[PDB]
Amino acid sequence: PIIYLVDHQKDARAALSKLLSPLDVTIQCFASAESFMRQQISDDAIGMIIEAHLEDKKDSGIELLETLVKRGFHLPTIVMASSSDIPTAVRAMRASAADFIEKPFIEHVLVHDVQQIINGAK
Amino acid sequence: PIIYLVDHQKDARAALSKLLSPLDVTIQCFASAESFMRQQISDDAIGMIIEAHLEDKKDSGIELLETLVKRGFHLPTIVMASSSDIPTAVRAMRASAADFIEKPFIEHVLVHDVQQIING
Amino acid sequence: PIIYLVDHQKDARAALSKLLSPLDVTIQCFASAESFMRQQISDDAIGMIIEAHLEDKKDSGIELLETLVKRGFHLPTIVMASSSDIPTAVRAMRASAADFIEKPFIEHVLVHDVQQIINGAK
């Protein structure tokens, strides 16, 4: 079981990976939408975590989600942002995000959201 | 033509530079206000883009603009900020900024302001 | 006199120590709560400066303060945080923080806070 994390913040990829390692899943990370788009989506992928504003480009992470959904890829996605206004949250939900989490986040919220994806997958 | 970019975030400098590359302009970066004050403003320079809170010191980017204005240097300046309250935006405008852009930013908004400086 | 600084951001630690160095106090830094909890609190320590969201984990720095308070340790503490809400600020004040400073911060605000700790310690 693989969950792709797309976030341009090095510390975030590090911190998030550590927090979720003791969960039954592999966290494969990407520093940008461009980098992730070169990735052959694995059949073992069950979910995704995406920073809403990749590289400080407002809503670029959500656009990535919208693009993937448009291309038929339907993986439960958790959208996260350390900066967010109401329209961004709404756009995220309309883009089918399973949840939108503001950062700094509460670890149990994230852990719970991921476990749910893990369980719903099996 | 040159546009000075003063932002303490390395990755940010790179991204903004890359984004503005296709435009008829060269971006010269500086990681801090002091680093910039060690600079004799060139005659080929037509504008600036400054992070409002350099090194987490609130409004320091705007104070740089304010001081530059007092020093006679007048270049259309785009002030950008991720963290921002109303007083900061108002200060930037009072400091003569051509625009105040919140980050995360909308790509074409920055591109448009820069092009407007180029055309000017 | 020593003032402990706990902040996961390498750049912040350097910038804050530089800014405060001129004052009559020595700043000793820590990259994490875990690392600080290993430190034997010196008798010369007169205060602390703690990032509220250590390693992106919401309120983890405030949690640290709460733990110190429960251990009978009472050193005037300045909690600092970027991107925070009311509850976080309220939680830090309840944890007995001497002050709560939003970042980006106004330089003299932090300096005056520290100067105050120095004067009240002698």
Q: At a CB cut-off of 8 Å and minimum separation 6, what does C43 contact?
A: none
Q: Using an 8 Å Cβ cutoff, are C84 and B85 in contact? A: no
C102 has which bridge partners? Answer: C81
Cis peptide bond prior to A76, omega within 30° of 0 = no
Q: In angstroms, what separates the C-alpha of B112 from chain A's closest C-alpha?
A: 15
Residue of B55, B58, B59 with shortest CB distance to C15: B55
> Residue C107 phi/psi, 5° resolution?
-40, -55
Of B57, B60, B83, the CB nearest to C82: B83
Contact B98, B77 (CB under 8 A): yes
A56–B107: do the CB atoms touch at under 8 Å?
no
Number of domains in chain C: 1
Helix H or strand E encompassing B117 = helix B107-119
Chains that touch A (3 or more CB pairs under 8 A): B, C
Residue C22 φ then ψ, to 5°? -55, -30
Distance (Å, whole) CA A50 – CA C57: 17
Q: Is A57 close to B107, i.e. CB distance below 8 A?
A: yes
Q: Say if residue C76 is preceded by a cis peptide, omega within 30 of 0.
A: no
- C105: three-class secondary structure by DSSP: strand
- State the CATH number of the domain containing residue B51: 3.40.50.2300
Residues of A in contact with C83 (CB under 8 A): 82-83, 104
Strand partners, C32: none
Pick the residue from chain B with its C-alpha nearest to C15: B55
Amino acid identity of B72? G
Closest CA to C81 of C41, C65, C67: C65
**Contact by Cβ (8 Å): A65, A87:** no
Give CA–CA dist B60/B46, Å, rounded. Answer: 22
Resolution (in Å) of the shown entry?
2.0
Tell me which residues of chain B have a C-beta less than 8 Å from any C-beta of chain C. Answer: 53, 55-60, 83
Residue spans of alpha helices (H) in C1-122: 10-20, 33-37, 60-70, 86-94, 107-119
* Euclidean distance between CA atoms A47 and A118, whole angstroms: 8
One-letter identity of residue B23 = L
* Alpha carbons C18 and C78: distance in angstroms, whole number: 17
Question: Do the bridges between strand A77-81 and strand A45-51 make them parallel or antiparallel, or are there none, so unpaired?
Answer: parallel
Segments forming the whole domain that contains residue C28: 1-122
C55 SS3 class? helix
